[PDB]
Amino acid sequence: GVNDLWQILEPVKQHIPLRNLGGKTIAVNLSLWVCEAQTVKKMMGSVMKPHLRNLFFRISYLTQMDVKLVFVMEGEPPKLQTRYGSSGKSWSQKTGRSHFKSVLRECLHMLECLGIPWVQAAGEAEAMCAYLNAGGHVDGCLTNDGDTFLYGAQTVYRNFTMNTKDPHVDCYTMSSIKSKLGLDRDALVGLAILLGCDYLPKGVPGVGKEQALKLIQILKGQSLLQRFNRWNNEVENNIKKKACCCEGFPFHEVIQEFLLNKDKLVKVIRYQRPDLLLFQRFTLEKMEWPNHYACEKLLVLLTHYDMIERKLGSRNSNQLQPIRIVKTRIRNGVHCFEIEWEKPEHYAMEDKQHGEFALLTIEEESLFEAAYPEIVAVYQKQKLEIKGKK
DNA sequence: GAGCCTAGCGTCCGGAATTC
DNA sequence: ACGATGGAGCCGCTAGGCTC
DNA sequence: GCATCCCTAAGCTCCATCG
DNA sequence: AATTCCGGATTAGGGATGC
Ligand SMILES: [Mg+2]
């Protein structure tokens, strides 16, 4: 968490709407989402836990945008005693941390119900995100604020929001940082050194406004030049650097903390079909969702998963079967079909007599045609029949 | 933060401020 | 017959107030 | 009978009642 | 300097009132 680093990286950031993330895989810092949900203050009298709710609806929206996800489960930080409130040990602090971990466990449970993979990070989640990105396992890393670039990530997405107007993420690519700003990974690390990180809150003595001028000065290397100083215009910025030298270079250990990679993968990242029964059970006992409501909310994820599998070329009997195409529709400028489906196993209906009429979705024409070309074919046949009739 | 539920709009064109 | 003017319902989008 | 002045709507799509 | 707005302008109807 460098002070003012995002401001430094602002000229490179690009406003990217969420729909434009289709076909991309993103690692998600689950902890940041859970804390963000904890920050909600509106529902004072009825503060139902929005950690699970926001997680689910974000997952649903991104899934409908053809965005696959893998969630990173935070581990233990490597480094942390003033015998005050400042020390993390305290009943309210400890028990609160236990509650946070419990919420994380529940979120993991819902991820398993949805069939979405989650990995285990050794330490900070950001490190595992950058590990997935650098390893080609994901296309981007989603974080409101973090040192993901310092852990070696190439692409970072920021400021996620689902506002009806302007759903977007601010994108930061490493290549455009090295080209437009001329900042390599080591340059970012050293910038985090003089400006301070989540480990070091101090931005002083270096003002930081002239550190960019130092980066303009030297083009070859960054950290090595901080190294020769231990053996030790230019004299003046080096004088402020001397004000940093009286500190004694305690941040070297932080450097090697950023550069060392401890994260590993135990199992291949895999996606499974959402479990309708397990999802009804979980949402019922954890969020007090009626079974019919949980089914109604999960239907779009079931249809999306099955359509994806059929497009991949694998078809099984357990997949959902469309009864018919009702009519063509348009959703946010996208051409879609209104699909009436057949009632799947363990699906709960609100209306006893008409629930089977109620089973309905709206799917993108492209993906639905890839999944059920026969259904699309008979619909287009009926359209040829109406145009031929008149 | 996101969803749910309700309401109401729905023309063309050009100067305008400064890219939802 | 005919088809034409209705007209009521619906559709897609946006906004506001309240709920989970 | 026709003119004047002001206000308001302005999407699409079936069916249906009417000349 | 360029691409979103919104304020004014269109066109057509309807109603109340005036010649
Ligand atoms: Mg973390």
Author numbering: 2 to 81, 91 to 242, 310 to 467
Extract from the study:
GEN1 belongs to the Rad2/XPG family of structure-selective nucleases that are conserved from yeast to humans. Although the catalytic cores are well conserved in the superfamily, substrate recognition is highly diverse: XPG/Rad2/ERCC5 recognizes bubble/loop structures during nucleotide-excision repair (NER), FEN1 cleaves flap substrates during Okazaki fragment processing in DNA replication, EXO1 is a 5'->3' exonuclease that is involved in HR and DNA mismatch repair (MMR) and GEN1 recognizes Holliday junctions. Interestingly, GEN1 shows versatile substrate recognition accommodating 5’ flaps, gaps, replication fork intermediates and Holliday junctions. According to the current model, however, the primary function of GEN1 is HJ resolution and it is suggested to be a last resort for the removal of joint molecules before cytokinesis.
In order to structurally characterize human GEN1, we crystallized the catalytically inactive variant GEN12-505 D30N, denoted GEN1 for simplicity, in complex with an immobile Holliday junction having arm lengths of 10 bp. The structure was determined experimentally and refined up to 3.0 Å resolution with an Rfree of 0.25. The HJ crystallized bridging between two protein monomers in the asymmetric unit. The overall structure of GEN1 resembles the shape of a downwards-pointing right hand with a 'thumb' extending out from the 'palm' and the DNA is packed against the ball of the thumb. The palm contains the catalytic core, which is formed by intertwined XPG-N and XPG-I domains. Notably, a small globular domain (residues 390–464) was found extending the GEN1 nuclease core at the wrist (pink). The domain has a chalice-shaped structure with three antiparallel β-strands packed against a C-terminal α-helix and it forms a characteristic aromatic cage. The GEN1-HJ structure revealed that the upstream DNA-binding interface acts as a docking site for double-stranded DNA and that the chromodomain secures its position.
